[PDB]
C-alpha cells in the first residue's frame with residue numbers, strides 16, 4: 001500500500017497559512033497547488049491553434065482537458081467515459097434528471113419518493129417537476145438510527161411509484177443509508193434512483209457499477225476543485241433516453257427553421273461553450289488525488305472528528321447529530337446561540353459554520369432550528385482538534 | 401480627452417507572446433493579467449471567516465464579488481443591479497427566457513419571430529419551446545446588405561406575434577441590425593424582445609435603457625473573462641414575472657414536503673453554489689476594461705480588419721462576408737479548402753478558424769458551406785495584418 005502521509009497531503013494547500021483552523025470543508029474545499037497552477041496556466045495560454053513559445057505547456061493542458069471525463073469515470077468506476085456529463089454543479093445535475101428524464105415520463109398521480117434527509121438540491125427539483133406533471137412527492141422518513149428508513153420502502157412503494165431520490169451521505173449527520181438495498185427495492189418496482197453524491201463523492205466515492213446506480217451527481221468545488229463545475233453520471237440507456245437539456249451550439253447536429261437534430265450523449269446534454277477552466281481544474285484535482293489512498297485519507301479525517309467529539313462530549317450541554325463516526329460533526333450547546341459561537345470561534349482563529357445547511361426538512365425532524373458543523377479533511381491536523389476544543393471552552397466561558 | 405493606446409492595452413495580456421497572431425477573439429478572448437491574478441488569489445485563499453495573514457487580499461476579493469453585478473449594470477447602463485442574473489453563458493441565459501418567461505405564456509398558434517442571422521443559441525431554444533407549446537417559429541430573412549430585414553418586420557408581425565429573437569451583432573458578418581427600430585416595432589405589437597449580445601456586449605455594449613431592451617444576454621469568456629460565467633439582463637418586471645429556473649438551495653426561501661417559496665430576483669433564478677471564481681473573474685475583467693475607451697478601442701480593431709480586407713481583396717478568389725466595416729472578418733477563397741488554409745496559417749503563426757460558427761441558416765442563406773474568420777481585438781496590431789496577408793499568400797502558393 002502507498003501509505004497516506006497527512007503532512008505531505010496538507011503541504012499541498014497554499015490557503016492553510018492564512019486559513020487558520022479550517023473546519024468548513026463540507027461547505028467548500030480548499031484547493032491544492034495542482035488546481036491553482038493548472039488554472040493559472042489555462043488563463044495565461046492561448047486556446048487557439050498557435051503556440052510560439054509555450055507549445056509544451058499547451059499540449060499538457062489539452063491533455064488534461066481531453067482526459068477529464070476518463071478521470072471522473074475512474075473515480076466512480078463507470079464502465080466508460082461517455083456516461084459522464086459536465087454540469088455546473090450537483091444542483092444542475094439533479095434538475096437535469098428531473099426535467100430531461102422524469103418530466104417526459106411522469107403522468108398525473110405518479111409518485112416520487114424523496115428522503116427526509118435530502119439536501120434541497122435533491123428535493124426542490126422534484127417538488128417542481130411534480131407540480132408541472134401532476135405527480136407527487138412522497139416522504140421517506142428517518143429510522144431510529146437517524147437514516148432514511150430504507151426498510152420502509154416496501155410499504156411506501158405503490159404501483160404508481162416512479163422515482164426515488166436518495167442521498168449517498170447526508171451533509172448534516174454524515175450518515176450513509178442502505179443505498180444498495182434501496183436500489184434493489186426501487187428496481188424491482190421499475191423505478192429509477194437519483195443519488196446525491198455531493199458529499200459521498202469526497203469521502204466514499206460511489207462504485208456505480210456494483211451499486212447499480214442509475215444517476216449520480218456531485219460538485220467539483222467540494223472535491224478540491226474549481227467552482228462552477230459539476231458531474232452527472234448516468235447509465236448509457238438512460239442518457240440516451242433523456243431529452244435534450246439546454247438548446248444551443250454543440251448539442252445540435254443539424255439545424256434549420258423546420259427543426260433540429262442533436263448529438264447523442266453526453267454532448268446531447270451539453271449546450272454552448274463548456275466551462276473549460278472548470279473541467280481542466282477538475283481534471284487536475286482528480287489526477288492529483290489519484291496519488292493518495294482515499295480510505296486512508298478518510299480514516300484520518302474521521303479519527304480527528306472522533307477525538308473532537310469525545311472532547312466536546314465532556315463539556316456540559318453538548319448535543320451531537322453525528323452518524324457513523326463521520327468526518328462531519330454537526331452539534332450545538334444548550335442555551336447558546338449558534339450565531340454567537342461561530343462568531344467567537346472565528347475570532348479565535350477557528351473557521352466553521354451553522355445555519356440550516358439547505359436541509360430544512362431534515363432539521364425539522366431532528367427538532368432543531370439549525371446546527372453548528374465542523375467538518376474534517378485529510379489536510380486537518382491533531383492540533384486543529386485541540387484548538388477547536390479550546391476555542392469552544394473559551395466561547396462557553398463568555399456565553400454561559 | 402484620452403487617446404486609446406493599443407501598445408498599453410496589449411501589454412496586459414500574458415498570453416500574447418505565445419499566441420502569435422491571435423485572430424480568434426470572436427470565439428474566445430485572451431485574458432488580462434487582472435483576471436489571471438484575481439482567479440489565482442481566489443483559489444489560493446480560504447473563503448471561510450478566518451484570515452490570519454492575508455486579510456487585505458481576502459477583503460479585496462470580497463469587494464470584487466460584491467461589486468460584480470454593479471459593474472455589469474454599469475456596462476449596460478441598467479437601472480438597477482438587481483436586474484442582472486448570473487448564468488453559465490449566453491446559451492443558458494436565452495434558454496432561461498424561453499423556459500421561464502415564454503413557455504408558461506405561449507398559446508398554440510402563437511408566433512415567435514427569429515432572425516435568420518441567429519447563432520444556434522438564439523434559435524434552438526425557440527424551436528424547442530415552440531414544439532413544447534404549439535407556438536410556431538417565424539423566420540425574419542436578411543435584407544440586401546446581409547442584415548436581418550427590420551423594414552420587413554411590420555409585414556411579418558401579426559395579431560399572434562409574441563416574441564422577437566434577434567442578435568445584436570452576428571458572429572459571422574459582424575453586422576448589427578437596426579435594433580432600436582426593431583424594438584419599437586415589436587413593442588407596438590405587445591411583443592417582448594430577446595437580444596443575443598454575445599458579440600455585441602464586446603464591441604458595442606448595449607445601453608439597455610436607451611434601446612428599451614427587455615432581455616439581453618452575453619458571455620464572460622468573450623469579454624476577456626473566465627469560462628463558465630454569463631449574464632442575463634432583464635427588466636425587473638420581467639424577472640419577477642418569470643418562473644424560477646433551477647430548484648435548489650439559494651433560490652428557495654422556505655422548503656417542505658408540501659411545497660416551497662422562492663427568493664425574489666435575481667436570487668430566484670440562481671440555484672445552488674454560484675461559479676464564484678467566474679463572478680470574481682468577470683468582475684475583475686470589467687474593472688480592468690473600465691479604464692479604456694471601448695468606443696476608441698473598437699475603432700482601432702475595425703481599422704485593422706479594414707486593412708486586412710483591403711489587402712486580401714487584391715488576391716484572386718477572395719470573397720468577404722463582412723458588414724459595416726466590422727472588426728469581424730469572415731471570408732473564403734474560391735477553390736481552396738478552409739481546413740487546409742487554417743492549418744497552413746497556424747504554421748505561419750496565425751490563429752483563426754473555419755467552420756459553420758453555430759450559424760447554419762445564415763451560411764445556407766449566404767450560399768456557403770462554411771467560412772474562415774479573422775476577428776480583430778484591440779490587442780492586435782498593424783503588424784498582425786501584414787503577417788496575416790503574407791501567410792495567406794504562401795498558403796495560396798502551397799494549395800493552388
Ligand SMILES: *Cc1c(COP(=O)(O)O)cnc(C)c1O
Pocket residue numbers: 088089090091092119121122167169170171196197198199219222230671672673674
Ligand atoms: C453542496 C451540496 C449540494 C449542492 O451543490 P451545488 O454545487 O451547490 O449545486 C447538494 N447536495 C449535497 C448533499 C451537498 O452537499
Ligand SMILES: *Cc1c(COP(=O)(O)O)cnc(C)c1O
Pocket residue numbers: 272273274426488489490491492519521522567569570571596597598599619620622630
Ligand atoms: C458565443 C456566442 C453565443 C454563445 O456563447 P456561450 O458562452 O457558448 O453560451 C451565442 N450567440 C453568439 C452571437 C455568440 O457569439
